[PDB]
Design a protein around this ligand. Structure first.
Ligand SMILES: CO[C@H]1O[C@H](CO)[C@@H](O)[C@H](O)[C@@H]1C
Ligand SMILES: OC[C@H]1O[C@H](O)[C@@H](O)[C@@H](O)[C@@H]1O
Ligand SMILES: [Ca+2]
Ligand code: NA
Length: 712
């Protein structure tokens, strides 16, 4: 699909009570430092765009990764004609016709009906071009400068802005610089000024067209001018062509077809949302050297940096996909994450722009371990191992950094029930421990590998054989009483015991053994899938959108709306019955489409999009750090995968219509493939992956299982 046909309102029909992706209509280049979106309202907090709104407040320069994190370093540009007494966004707002507008990754185009203005925004990595066609005779641009600001007019054609605004930041004066060069001159001079919540009306007089070339920096005004100078001569058409080529660089890596072209349209909308985050958070100085802002020291520091990622989300799918098709980005992003550790003392958890904490666990450890076992940035793994061992043995004095209950986990073999969400923290630390063991192993560090492989079995501490769930346990080894399987919160993050008891990616064979047999585990998985989607709210005291998104559909406790359930269909692969889940995977993929209601829950910065992309191809990374993809059920008929190593994997299915719900046979390079997984090395060899599909199952009788520590 051509990037210009992607409609960025995909996944944007949201509110606090219910998510269909909690996406914004992000216009930008891949991993752009800024994104650009129309703002329709200032009365709904983080939900400042809705696709059903007919009001246009301005073009918002945004860094907002999710409505839960909020924005940082934002401002707006609003074309205006005529006089305004009052310059508030509400007083300057115009209606617009969404159905006559363009909402695409490389271009916004819309008409303000109040002003008879039609305008076009094209993005670049650090800036963009805003072209403004005025019908009226007194023409302006309104800059909305939230928080503390500075603005000045440098000459007739140049304006410089600084704004300080954020939702959370270690630097209370966190500054963003924004520079505008106008083709047509300013007709009114104003003196340098500063204040809070700026409303600056720039005047151009009677011109038919203004062309605004803009750039930005987290370094300085002078760096923002250097970023602008590098692209000032571009016409809007040339910047648009370059942005189309940037997106085609990534889209061209996965050329797919389907029986149903609606499925292809869904694929490419999720692929657009897979190359946005993490956002570039470094600039190139006068010597082309990477520099960035370090909010911990409040200084400019050398090196790459990336932002807008919660590894709790993105470790699941994003970095594994990048390990196949965007290794050059993974390489640079790992360098940035290590820089975050260098600057703060702890490997990052939730960057927006700097450490926000929020979710349980230190899942950066899986991003690191997956890279180590795939030979990505082996040069950094000794530095990563030191950072990981520090996070596993030392408690940050600051609540947002590293492990919570670090020392209690080491004393007891679990985080005790007095900690919030102790089941998640326990299971995430045991999985982290596996990840640390894998990095150690790649470095031939036997003592570290042995100790952390043993720590990785700590999931066993919270398994209650009386219930068949993971439950919180106090310091005397007693399970919290009054257990209810469907009760959300308190001991579990955004789920019940059903959404939390299977986070054992390092050792499913060992978890299965705790149930007593492959058959007792099978019965538990069947009950999870086939029951009603009932929930109890008591751990929260009210219903949250994750509950509502599970209860909106009849897929039992398999809450595909949120990350904890993403791997659930693959649990059948660990008992040698993947055929039980092949229909279920195709039916789960039908919960996605390219519409404004197109995701089953929060998309989370590529996480759910890459879930869809992997499942479309028919395999999935259940265990980052194992170097394997567990086989599912493909939705494509064809795929040409351009691998980062320069080879090509060509996928071909037999006719893949709605009645094909099973895999009959797989050939990899014309050889029968019976294992319920692929190694990373097998896929990197490239060649041909042929799926013969079925309308009935074809049970394989093989003892082969995907990776588990306890059986390796
Ligand atoms: C505070 O926001 C987080 O936590 C909330 C639960 O407290 C979620 O409903 C929401 O989706 C997000 C992950
Ligand atoms: O956006 C922050 C946070 O919101 C909610 C969670 O379910 C996460 O998936 C996400 O990381
Ligand atoms: Ca989520
Ligand atoms: Na939806």
């Amino acid at each position: 699909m051509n990037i210009q046909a992607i409609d960025t309102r995909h996944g944007t029909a949201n509110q606090h009570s219910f998510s269909n992706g909690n996406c914004l209509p992000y216009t930008g280049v891949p991993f752009g430092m800024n994104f650009y979106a129309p703002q329709t309202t200032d009365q709904k907090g983080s939900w400042w765009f809705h696709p059903e709104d007919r009001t246009f407040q301005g073009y918002r320069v945004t860094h907002q990764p999710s409505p839960w994190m909020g924005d940082f370093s934002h401002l707006l540009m609003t074309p205006v004609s005529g006089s305004l007494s009052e310059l508030s966004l509400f007083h300057a707002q115009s209606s617009y016709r969404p159905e006559e507008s363009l909402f695409s990754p490389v271009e916004i185009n819309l008409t303000q009906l109040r002003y008879q203005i039609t305008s076009q925004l094209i993005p670049s990595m650090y800036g963009g071009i805003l072209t403004i066609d005025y019908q009226q005779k007194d023409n302006h641009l309104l800059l909305t400068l939230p928080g503390r600001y500075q603005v000045k007019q440098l000459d007739d054609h140049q304006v410089a802005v600084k704004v300080i605004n954020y939702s959370g930041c270690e630097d209370p004066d966190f500054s963003f610089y924004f520079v505008l060069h106008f083709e047509q001159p300013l007709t009114k001079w104003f003196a340098p000024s500063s204040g809070e919540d700026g409303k600056i009306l720039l005047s151009f007089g009677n011109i038919a067209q203004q062309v605004v070339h803009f750039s930005s920096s987290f370094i300085s005004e002078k760096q923002a001018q250097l970023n602008l100078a590098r692209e000032i001569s571009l016409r809007s058409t040339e910047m648009l062509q370059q942005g189309i080529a940037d997106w085609h660089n990534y889209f061209d890596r996965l050329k797919v077809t389907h029986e149903n072209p609606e499925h292809t349209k869904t694929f490419y909308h999720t692929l657009y949302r897979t190359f946005l985050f993490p956002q570039t958070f470094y600039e190139l100085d006068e010597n082309q050297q990477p520099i960035h802002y370090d909010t911990f020291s409040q200084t400019v520091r050398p090196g790459v940096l990336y932002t807008n990622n919660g590894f709790w989300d993105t470790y699941k799918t994003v970095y594994p996909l990048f390990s196949l098709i965007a290794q050059e980005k993974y390489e640079e992003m790992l360098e940035g994450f290590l820089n975050s550790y260098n600057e703060t003392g702890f490997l990052p958890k939730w960057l927006s722009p700097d450490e926000r904490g929020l979710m349980p666990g230190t899942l950066i450890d899986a991003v690191i371990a997956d890279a180590a076992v795939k030979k990505i940035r082996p040069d950094l793994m000794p530095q990563f191992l030191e950072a990981m061992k520090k996070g596993a043995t030392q408690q940050s004095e600051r609540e947002n950094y590293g492990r919570q209950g670090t020392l209690d986990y080491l004393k007891y073999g679990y985080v005790p029930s007095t900690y919030h969400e102790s089941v998640n923290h326990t299971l995430d630390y045991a999985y982290s421990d596996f990840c640390i063991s894998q990095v150690a192993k790649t470095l031939n560090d036997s003592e570290t590998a042995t100790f952390y492989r043993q720590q990785a079995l700590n999931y066993q501490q919270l398994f209650n054989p009386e219930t068949g769930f993971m439950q919180a346990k106090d310091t005397e080894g007693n399970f919290r009483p009054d257990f209810l399987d469907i009760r959300w919160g308190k001991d579990y993050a955004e789920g019940s015991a059903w959404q939390s008891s299977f986070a054992v990616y390092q050792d499913f064979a060992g978890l299965i053994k705790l149930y007593g047999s492959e058959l007792a585990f099978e019965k538990k998985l069947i009950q999870l899938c086939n029951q009603a989607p009932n929930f109890n709210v008591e751990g929260y005291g009210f219903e949250i959108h994750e509950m509502s998104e599970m209860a909106a559909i009849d897929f039992g406790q398999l809450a595909i709306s949120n990350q904890p359930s993403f791997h659930y269909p693959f649990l059948f692969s660990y008992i040698g019955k993947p055929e039980m889940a092949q229909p279920l995977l195709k039916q789960l993929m039908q919960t996605f489409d390219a519409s404004p209601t197109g995701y089953p829950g929060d998309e989370d910065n590529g996480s759910m999009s890459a879930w869809y992309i992997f499942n479309s191809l028919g395999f999935y990374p259940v265990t980052p750090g194992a170097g394997e993809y567990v086989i599912g059920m493909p939705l494509v008929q064809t795929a040409e995968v351009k691998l980062s190593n320069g080879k090509q994997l060509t996928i071909q299915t037999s006719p893949n219509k709605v009645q094909q719900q099973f895999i009959h046979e797989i050939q990899l390079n014309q050889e029968k493939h019976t294992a319920p997984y692929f190694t990373h090395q097998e896929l990197l060899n490239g060649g041909t992956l042929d799926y013969q599909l079925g309308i009935v199952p074809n049970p394989q009788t093989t003892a082969e299982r995907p990776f588990s520590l306890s059986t390796e």
